Amino acid sequence: GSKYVDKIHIGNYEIDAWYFSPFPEDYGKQPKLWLCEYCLKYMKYEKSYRFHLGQCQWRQPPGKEIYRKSNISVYEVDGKDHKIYCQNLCLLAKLFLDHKTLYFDVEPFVFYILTEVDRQGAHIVGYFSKEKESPDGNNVASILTLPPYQRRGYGKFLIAFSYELSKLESTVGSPQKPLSDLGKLSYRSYWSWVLLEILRDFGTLSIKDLSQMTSITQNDIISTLQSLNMVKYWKGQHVICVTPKLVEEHLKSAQYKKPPITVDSVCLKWAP
Template structure:
């Protein structure tokens, strides 16, 4: 194995690449090249075989190596990622008719082509240097810059550190626009309406897209309300994450998008916002569900939260009716069923679908890694309503036709046997 001359590198070929911060070599596909504006050196954009796109990065040629055997093999056999894409294309073609296939395939390919290369490698956000995960459609030359500087108060973005430093001295904002609806210790949550604070919300969405793969809301923010979570110190309120919710959504979605910036993940902030989304839903007298499909990290958080709510309800009572648990928690009954199935607890008993759980099974469930009590518990009494815009829509109330009877008949039985 030996380094490759920059003149011998070919786009679309697979090489061994040394990843950032590691001496281990990985198979990677060369996707695009460019000349770095700061150094004037040629760089290559690589996708690591078998890894999520969030790990894609721009690298110098010194980190690329050639293995002679792999070169011969790669010319005759498809790489794993190419083989997987071919299999996925075949599965999609088999599952859909010609019209559905063509339309969905075109949209999928368009999204892939537009977002496959991320130009922005890292951002400066407050005191953090954050490496990005995905492409984000920042306008003009901002989207082609290798790095951006983002104000953690107003979300304004800049290409140059000098402009950023000047902006920090001139920026008058010390908290998000909108209404503070929750405050506990050093955390605050603000309700921000997209139609009243369009620029702020657009900047928020562009920032979030750097860490979300399939987010499509960038500029059409008017129909949405944003709930912005902040860490509060003596300088002001610094945004660490948010979720958005569409006004007047007819599909029962209580959350459209959720994002916690990487430096603030694993602090319990995601589940705190999930709790808030359900608390707002309960106060509206409804139950709700996040917009599907969920990202991989989003699904893990939601399944963990749904499972925790279910297990806690079982711990406190010897019988739990799914429809009642839905009213108490604001969780869509279908999502509770998903949690039950994910835990593999569904049984058929006496003509009904039930959960038949002993104290031993319950204790084993509570020990599962996925079922964790949230690090931060939302204090519902500290929640203050902002205001909701009433949207009057004339429509057929078909909600009861969308819920299968079995969900409301499902009973959870807990015995001492």
């Protein structure tokens, strides 16, 4: 019986762990792990953390700042160019994801770090990772908002951002399964809101059209429309069955209302 990491201190926050994460044994044995909020170095003792805070020069994530809108910034970090950082980030994320798979061999991934910026620097709020090439068309590998930031719109921002990447690449995608319970709700909310706003405005459109407009897969569009009861089935084909008033009725609900923070595509500066 060797103790696991059960508590971290990061920035001004203390956060209890939700799941096993494979930090080295000597690190799990300690009462609390201490993480630099910028370089994500993990440390055993308050004294080595205090020393690091006074020495570390990083005040943002590494990689490229590919989105900036007011005090929200997203940083793109290649797992091959910044392997230790990405390894730390994965260890941190495994404390709050049950089924996240890889931690150490991060070269196949790009990581998108969501930050909230103030005078002291750019503070990590959440992330998603993404396979550089995905056979099964997963535009998200793992995705996480850190607990003290959850249920405030940051998770839907991440989801939206991942689809804006997909729209840029002219592809559709879907997050890797399994999702967390919070993950399923956040995706169902985002999918529903995106589709309802399109159907509210819009010439008529097919399932394949909505897929082309949103980068949401047809299967994810279909299952969203079924849960909203806005699709008919006619001899093996799903057909959109939109009553223009029930669309409005759905948009006044809390589960499918607009997310408070939205990705302004103009502020996204990206390319292959």
